[PDB]
């Protein structure tokens, strides 16, 4: 197989690129805010039930 060339390096590089992109997608969608806000202890918002 070593006589056929360098196809395996290309395969590995492509798969690694796909995986890194998969992580970046979730990071870009969800990690919008910078603070972890917390809801107040008393849940009364004028009649709306969340």
């Amino acid at each position: 197989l070593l006589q056929y060339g360098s196809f395996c390096t290309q395969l590995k590089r492509a798969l690694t690129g796909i995986a890194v992109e998969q992580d970046k997608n979730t990071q870009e969608v969800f990690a919008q805010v910078k603070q972890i806000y917390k809801t107040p202890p008393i849940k009364y918002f004028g009649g709306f039930n969340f």
């Binding site: 979730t26 990071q27 969800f30 805010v33 603070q35 806000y37 969340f50």
Partner: peptide, 18 residues
């Protein structure tokens, strides 16, 4: 995956509270 489900839930809860 790098982010667990709990971390994603925490992000969603932060967005809702904000």
């Amino acid at each position: 995956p790098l982010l667990t489900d709990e971390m994603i839930a925490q992000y969603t809860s932060a967005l809702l509270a904000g």
